[PDB]
Design a protein around this nucleic acid. Structure first.
Ligand SMILES: Nc1ccn([C@@H]2O[C@H](COP(=O)(O)OP(=O)(O)OP(=O)(O)O)[C@@H](O)[C@H]2O)c(=O)n1
Length: 573
DNA sequence: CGTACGTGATCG
């Protein structure tokens, strides 16, 4: 057993100017969720507090909100947001063990204190899953069990801060934690708590029309197949296509396959159309409506800041980072995302080709840097170079194929992978790649060098010193090793872009505050920032937002930001 | 050829 005081009231010694603090929210989605318990560990001892008591105590609430009273936590954003829903401000979080663990090694998948602790041979704390259970059997245990668990977590955080900070310093990542990820955590908390207003009537109207079109195409499919079957079943669909109708096998029924089969039978295009409507209906209408809060008609995503292996955020419940845009039918979903106040507008700013600009910078490729210095259309320029033609001679198919090469280069180029993407032979794809590297020899040297460096050091890094370990780079299995080489090529690009936009968000918020604008961030989608603001602020934002985003870092090429605003997210185009 | 998440089907 670990010793602690199970307090009935808050005392002064619990309010020291440095503590490990646990404000426990067990529900996965912490929005408007209960706080089940509080633990504090500091120089004076270890304390468990009941939240109905602590959170009603003015001295404790003042302590929580006092920036000069420093707290060490794990996933402080969870606590901060749960407290925001209770009208309580959390300040002074100086160390977040989740973010520290994430920066040291995102591959550990650390999502509880016990997992972080094990990184430093500290095992005197249980995994959350062992305490709460998983799935439907999940539950908050009785007080003695709960209290001991929260105290052990606080004690672990209290013990682990120094070793974690020491290692971050050794890796030259301590500023990344303290000046980037931790401040960003607070900004993410604000964005999540603000939420995004949804026009549910509009979504419901779209739902109704979709359902009608769905019925129509569904019956057309049955008529064409000469029978009814579950179109969403791969088994049944595969039978209909490849046995009853005898279509060729190029069973995979992925979209790319169906697109190749479309010429053989009228049913195929109907099946694609059906899947597409069904996607919109199930995921982007019905699924979105399920998570809208009925009182305020807002969705409050959770941005997972300690999940991706490259330093990107992810977004859940709902995922607001994969709302359709490419095809008009799906893009209309965005008409349902609206400003939260009357006479406000949505303002969206996106980096133009940030990944290829970062590549130009890190590779110091003269041709690619010159292309961005001239603000050329990069896909047209790449086509000119690889196909050896003048700008006026670049055909649409050529630009399309060059664009695909540009994607492959950023992802970690593969002849089989590019070949798959363009529906061409491996030798054909290999020729394109060779021509690319002939035109961009700095990029080739960079790709060769970064793989060698990954092998030598064991990891790759981003501009702001994020790291990703790549143990498979030495595998004697070709496929395993090749995937690791692709990660070595891609991670510094994708990850540096993530560093840049994170810093831009911090810089933007500081400027917004200085200027006392009411404008605020709502979402980030990897290389874009979505805000809402009074209509009277648009002219100022048109100058401020792109400037801050462009100046977040200084590269060997310019950063370029495009922007638009409108009455809904759809119209901010 | 990179990084995510949600869904419906499947399947233990
Ligand atoms: N102790 C440190 C040093 C650097 N960085 C990160 O790395 C970035 C660039 O570091 P910087 O020192 O300014 O440039 P370099 O000289 O290239 O790096 P180094 O420390 O090796 O000299 C910083 O902005 C920061 O994000 C950090 O997180 N912690």
């Amino acid at each position: 057993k670990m010793a602690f005081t199970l307090a009935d009231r808050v005392t002064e010694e619990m309010l020291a100017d440095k503590a490990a603090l646990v404000v426990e929210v067990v529900e996965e989605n912490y929005h408007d969720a209960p706080i089940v318990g509080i633990a504090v560990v500091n120089e004076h001892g270890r304390f468990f507090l009941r939240p109905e008591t602590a959170l009603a105590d003015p001295q404790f609430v003042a302590w929580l909100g006092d920036e000069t009273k420093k707290k060490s936590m794990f996933d402080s954003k969870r606590a901060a947001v749960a407290l925001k829903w209770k009208g309580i401000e959390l300040c002074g979080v100086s160390f977040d063990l989740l973010l520290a663990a994430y920066l040291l090694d995102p591959a550990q998948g650390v999502d509880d204190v016990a997992a972080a602790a094990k990184m430093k041979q500290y095992e005197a704390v249980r995994p959350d899953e062992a305490v709460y259970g998983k799935g439907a059997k999940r539950a908050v245990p009785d007080e003695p069990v709960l209290a001991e668990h929260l105290v052990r977590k606080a004690a672990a955080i209290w013990e682990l801060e120094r070793p974690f900070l020491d290692e971050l310093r050794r890796n030259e990542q301590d500023r990344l934690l303290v000046e980037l990820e931790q401040p960003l955590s607070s900004i993410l908390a604000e964005m999540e708590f603000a939420g995004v207003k949804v026009d549910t009537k509009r979504l419901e109207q779209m739902g109704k029309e979709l359902a009608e079109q769905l019925g129509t195409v569904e019956q057309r499919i049955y008529e064409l197949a000469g029978q009814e079957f579950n179109i969403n079943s791969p088994k049944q669909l595969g039978v209909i296509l490849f046995e009853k109708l005898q279509l060729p096998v190029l069973y995979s029924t992925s979209a790319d396959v169906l697109e190749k089969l479309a010429p053989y039978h009228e049913i195929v295009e109907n099946i694609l159309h059906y899947r597409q409507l069904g996607k919109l209906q199930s995921t982007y209408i019905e699924g979105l409506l399920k998570v809208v809060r009925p009182d305020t008609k807002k969705v409050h995503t959770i941005f997972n800041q300690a999940l991706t292996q490259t330093g990107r955020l992810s977004s859940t419940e709902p995922n607001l980072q994969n709302i359709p845009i490419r095809l008009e039918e799906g893009r209309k979903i965005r008409q349902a995302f609206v400003p939260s106040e009357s006479d406000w507008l949505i303002f969206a700013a996106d980096y133009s080709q940030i990944e290829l600009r970062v590549l130009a910078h890190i590779a110091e490729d003269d041709n690619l840097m010159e292309a961005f210095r001239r603000d050329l259309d990069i896909h047209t320029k790449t086509a000119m170079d690889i196909f050896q033609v003048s700008e006026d001679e670049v055909t649409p198919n050529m630009r399309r194929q060059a664009k695909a090469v540009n994607f492959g280069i950023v992802y970690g180029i593969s002849d089989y992978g590019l070949a798959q993407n363009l529906n061409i032979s491996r030798k054909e794809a290999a020729e394109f790649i060779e021509r690319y590297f002939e035109s961009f020899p700095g990029v080739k040297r960079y790709m060769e060098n970064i793989v060698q460096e990954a092998k030598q050091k064991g990891y790759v890094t981003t501009l702001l010193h994020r790291r990703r370990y790549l143990p498979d780079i030495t595998s004697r299995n070709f496929n395993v090793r090749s995937f690791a080489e692709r990660m070595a090529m891609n991670t510094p690009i994708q990850g540096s872009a993530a560093d840049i936009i994170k810093k831009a968000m911090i810089d933007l918020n500081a400027r917004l505050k200085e200027e006392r604008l009411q404008a605020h961030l709502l979402l980030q989608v990897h290389d874009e920032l979505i805000l809402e603001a009074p209509k009277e602020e648009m002219e100022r934002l048109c100058r401020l937002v792109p400037e801050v985003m462009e100046q977040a870092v200084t590269l060997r090429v310019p950063l370029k930001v495009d922007y638009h605003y409108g009455s809904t997210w759809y119209d901010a185009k």
